């Protein structure tokens, strides 16, 4: 079926409003950025707060958050269900 985590072009502040209401750590969504057209953002809840990450793209067209590169957003999301998205906190993605 369709992915549960793709929310299209929603404002940053609306993504924080929606995620704040979730109760589990790791609840997340991918959105199309309004400040940087053509880029995607990953918004995730952890520890009563919401953090935003930019999905980076390199010179081969691959997507990544830090070092490990992926050929699709779907592969980057599923890798981060079991490897943290943060370097200082353990934040594993969980669908809303």
């Amino acid at each position: 079926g369709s992915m549960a985590w793709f929310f299209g072009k929603i404002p940053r502040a609306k993504a924080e409003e929606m995620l704040s209401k979730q109760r589990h750590d790791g609840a997340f969504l991918i959105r199309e950025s309004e400040s940087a057209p053509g880029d995607f953002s990953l918004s995730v809840k952890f520890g009563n707060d919401v953090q935003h990450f930019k999905v980076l793209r390199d010179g081969a067209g691959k997507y990544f958050l830090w070092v490990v590169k992926f050929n699709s957003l779907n592969e980057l999301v599923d890798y981060h269900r079991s490897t943290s998205v943060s370097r200082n906190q353990q934040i594993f993605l969980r669908d809303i």
Binding site: S35, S41, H52
Partner: peptide, 9 residues
């Protein structure tokens, strides 16, 4: 441009 955890300012 706002900030992102993985984009160092």
């Amino acid at each position: 441009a706002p900030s992102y955890v993985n984009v160092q300012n």
